Amino acid sequence: MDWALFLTFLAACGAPATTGALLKPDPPRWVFPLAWTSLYFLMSLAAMRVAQLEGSGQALAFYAAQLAFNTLWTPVFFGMKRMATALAVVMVMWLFVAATMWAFFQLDTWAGVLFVPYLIWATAATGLNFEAMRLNWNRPEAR
Amino acid sequence: MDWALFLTFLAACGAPATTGALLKPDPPRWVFPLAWTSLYFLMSLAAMRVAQLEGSGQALAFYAAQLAFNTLWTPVFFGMKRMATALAVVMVMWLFVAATMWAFFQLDTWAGVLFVPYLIWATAATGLNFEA
Numbered sequence: 001m002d003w004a005l006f007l008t009f010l011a012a013c014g015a016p017a018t019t020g021a022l023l024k025p026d027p028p029r030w031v032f033p034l035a036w037t038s039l040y041f042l043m044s045l046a047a048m049r050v051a052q053l054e055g056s057g058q059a060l061a062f063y064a065a066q067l068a069f070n071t072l073w074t075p076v077f078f079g080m081k082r083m084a085t086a087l088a089v090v091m092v093m094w095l096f097v098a099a100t101m102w103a104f105f106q107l108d109t110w111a112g113v114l115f116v117p118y119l120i121w122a123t124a125a126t127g128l129n130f131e132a133m134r135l136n137w138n139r140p141e142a143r
Numbered sequence: 144m145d146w147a148l149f150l151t152f153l154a155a156c157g158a159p160a161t162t163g164a165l166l167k168p169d170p171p172r173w174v175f176p177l178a179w180t181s182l183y184f185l186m187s188l189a190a191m192r193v194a195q196l197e198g199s200g201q202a203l204a205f206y207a208a209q210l211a212f213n214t215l216w217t218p219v220f221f222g223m224k225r226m227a228t229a230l231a232v233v234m235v236m237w238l239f240v241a242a243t244m245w246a247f248f249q250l251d252t253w254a255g256v257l258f259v260p261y262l263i264w265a266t267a268a269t270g271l272n273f274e275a
């Protein structure tokens with residue numbers, strides 16, 4: 001554990017948490033932020049553990065990547081409602097979430113375990129968006 | 144010294160580059176993407192160098208943070224046009240860019256030099272957002 005690292009990783013999660021606060025997507029109303037606080041805590045904890053180990057550069061490169069495409073996804077799907085663009089982003093995102101998880105696993109089992117529920121959300125995100133997709137596949141404004 | 148690392152960091156820049164492709168700001172028209180193409184390679188080269196050194200965790204935590212608030216800033220300023228919210232974002236973004244830069248500097252001089260033109264953009268970004 002290191003407080004600088006952890007606080008740094010959680011602070012970074014404020015970027016996608018903001019997206020969600022602003023473009024509230026779309027069940028009692030505490031479930032969504034409670035689900036997200038847990039996810040942000042779990043992944044900041046995992047990155048913090050991994051950030052201290054030798055050989056972690058690649059996993060941390062993956063972590064930056066999933067984090068940025070996470071932040072991108074919400075405003076492209078729910079903001080611009082550009083469903084095709086948003087499909088590519090979410091699959092690229094899903095790929096880095098999985099990549100992070102697996103690279104975490106190969107350095108630290110706990111770090112990988114702590115990312116499983118986040119891969120589950122990313123799988124939800126992809127599913128939702130695959131549909132929105134080819135309901136709107138023929139409207140090039142949605143694309 | 145590593146294509147995986149580099150290609151992974153450059154791929155990550157695709158997220159904020161996408162924002163820019165979508166919410167077109169605002170001068171010969173190749174200038175905008177040429178500057179951003181330059182900015183993305185420079186910062187991926189720098190991240191690549193640092194990711195290989197030991198003690199790099201804190202700088203790489205910084206790198207992730209600026210990247211996300213970079214990605215966040217454009218859709219909040221140009222997308223949602225919420226000028227106040229976007230001010231907090233861009234100041235938070237500016238701060239992590241400077242931090243990435245300085246922590247890179249402490250591990251590898253070249254990595255730090257390679258972030259200066261990006262700190263310069265980040266200051267422009269902050270400057271723009273203050274008059275709005």
Ligand SMILES: CCCCCCCC/C=C/CCCCCCCC(=O)OC[C@H](O)CO
Nearest residue numbers: 091092094095122123124125126127128130
């Ligand atoms: C390493 C070589 C691979 C590189 C090339 C492959 C690119 C990776 C993309 C994968 C997308 C996987 C799909 C993500 C999960 C699907 C979600 C889904 O189908 O279920 C949700 C549905 O709404 C439930 O009701």
Ligand SMILES: CCCCCCCC/C=C\CCCCCCCC(=O)OC[C@H](O)CO
Nearest residue numbers: 010011013014016017020033036037040074
């Ligand atoms: C200011 C620095 C403080 C350091 C602490 C960092 C604060 C951000 C992290 C999590 C807490 C907020 C979680 C509340 C729920 C956010 C909602 C959300 O994330 O929405 C999902 C989004 O759409 C999917 O990209």
Ligand SMILES: CCCCCCCC/C=C\CCCCCCCC(=O)OC[C@H](O)CO
Nearest residue numbers: 150154156157159160162163176179180217
């Ligand atoms: C190996 C996989 C890599 C695949 C390749 C992905 C590389 C994407 C990054 C460079 C493209 C250059 C884009 C230049 C024009 C971008 C315009 C833009 O970035 O706008 C600025 C944005 O608004 C401010 O955040």
